[PDB]
Design a protein around this ligand. Structure first.
Ligand code: MG
Ligand code: NA
Ligand code: NA
Lengths: 210, 211
């Protein structure tokens, strides 16, 4: 048996003064997750490029919890549909960081990618990255994953650039709102919103304000 | 460079002056055929250096100019640097080659409009409001020639001044120009009449464009 006591007002309310209906309760999903004792506790993906965007390096930093052992390994593999395009494997124990050493519970994998398909709102090219925690010998402990889009965002000479070209933001602000269910969100509604946006020449959205 | 007495008068009455080297090669094809040619450098230098030597003590002179309508040659860059070195007390400007070259401290277009772009190949005239905010641009903008007063003219003059006031980096300009260049001729009764190009049997000519 679970018992949850939900307060309408708290000291948190002082920082939640958005121009919207003020409601309360458990308005998003509740779930239960099972992880091993030795587990993946965090992971970061980065993509950086050469000047013409014909070569990329994908960089993935992974962290673990549990007991540290020499047999432990991470493999990050990059997939495009059913084709594996790159892969890296390494033992834990990052670069030396200061006078006391490095993170023995962390590892960085770097994968080279030639002529990468780039992500933009015009053509949303995606790769699938799979992060496996395992033994030297190849026995899986667990796996996490995410979608990867190869893109660069930088400001130069006063212009916001995406993949080297100057952006033109056709954007809108969107609160999470439904007339019957209040501030509860569902997939059917979200998909309905995105289709209407794109059918009406919008290319960007702001999560106003949370 | 003007008659020496002009500088004296501007010191005393109070007027700001742009002092300009005797250099204009408008009719060359292309416009920088001479000013990019190192064989014409000594001839050009003497027209810039001797102006600076004669005039550098008048307070009314606040800006030096490398000439006009001669495109942009490497001779301009060398001479720009000569002035910046012997006299740091005054900004240097020059219009040729697109008004914003490496040979000018001040974006000095001629006949650039307030809101409307004129995007000529190689040497565009952007709207002055747009020009200040072009990626990576920081300099002030002061038109070296604007509002051409030929005949019944000066329409839309208010529009420049509304912009000059609203924009800190738009610091105004020099109307073209002060006085009609017409000459006197006489009829059979001795009555004088005002003449323009063509009226002396001079040909080819450009008719009323001198007024
Ligand atoms: Mg508000
Ligand atoms: Na101004
Ligand atoms: Na004229």
């Amino acid at each position: 048996r679970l018992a949850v006591m939900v307060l309408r007002w708290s000291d948190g309310s002082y920082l939640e003064d958005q121009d919207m209906w003020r409601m309360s309760g458990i308005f998003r999903d509740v779930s239960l997750l099972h992880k091993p004792t030795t587990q993946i506790s965090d992971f970061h993906v980065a993509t950086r490029f050469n000047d013409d965007f014909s070569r990329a390096v994908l960089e993935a930093e992974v962290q673990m919890c549990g007991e540290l052992r020499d047999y432990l390994r991470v493999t990050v593999s990059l997939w495009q549909g059913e084709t594996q395009v790159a892969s890296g494997t390494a033992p834990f124990g990052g670069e030396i960081i200061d006078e006391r050493g490095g993170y023995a519970d962390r590892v960085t994998l770097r994968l080279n990618v030639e002529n990468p398909k780039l992500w933009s709102a015009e053509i949303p090219n995606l790769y699938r990255a799979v992060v496996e925690l395992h033994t030297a010998d190849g026995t899986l402990i667990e796996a996490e994953a995410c979608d990867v889009g190869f893109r660069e965002v930088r400001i130069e000479n006063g212009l916001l650039l995406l993949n080297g070209k100057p952006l033109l933001i056709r954007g809108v602000n969107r609160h999470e709102h439904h007339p019957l269910h209040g501030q509860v969100m569902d997939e059917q509604t979200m998909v309905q919103d995105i289709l209407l946006m794109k059918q009406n020449n919008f290319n960007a959205v702001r999560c106003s304000h949370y | 460079p003007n008659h020496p007495l002009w500088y004296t008068l501007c010191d005393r009455y109070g007027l700001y002056v742009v002092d300009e080297a005797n250099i204009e090669t408008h009719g060359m094809v292309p416009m920088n055929r001479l000013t990019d040619d190192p064989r014409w450098l000594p001839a050009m230098s003497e027209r810039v250096t001797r102006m600076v030597q004669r005039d550098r003590n008048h307070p009314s002179v606040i800006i030096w100019s490398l000439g006009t309508e001669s495109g942009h040659g490497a001779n301009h860059d060398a001479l720009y640097r000569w002035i910046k070195s012997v006299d740091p007390s005054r900004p240097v400007q020059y219009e040729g080659g697109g008004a914003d070259t490496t040979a000018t401290d001040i974006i000095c277009p001629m006949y650039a409009r307030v809101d409307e772009d004129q995007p000529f190949p190689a040497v565009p005239k952007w709207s002055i409001k747009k020009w200040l905010s072009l990626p990576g641009e920081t300099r002030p903008l002061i038109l070296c020639e604007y509002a051409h007063a030929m005949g019944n003219s000066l329409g839309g003059f208010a529009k420049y001044w509304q912009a000059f006031r609203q924009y800190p980096r738009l610091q105004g300009g020099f109307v073209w120009d002060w006085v009609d260049q017409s000459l006197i001729k006489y009829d059979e009764n001795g009555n004088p009449w005002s003449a323009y190009g063509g009226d002396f049997g001079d040909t080819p000519n450009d008719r009323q464009f001198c007024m």
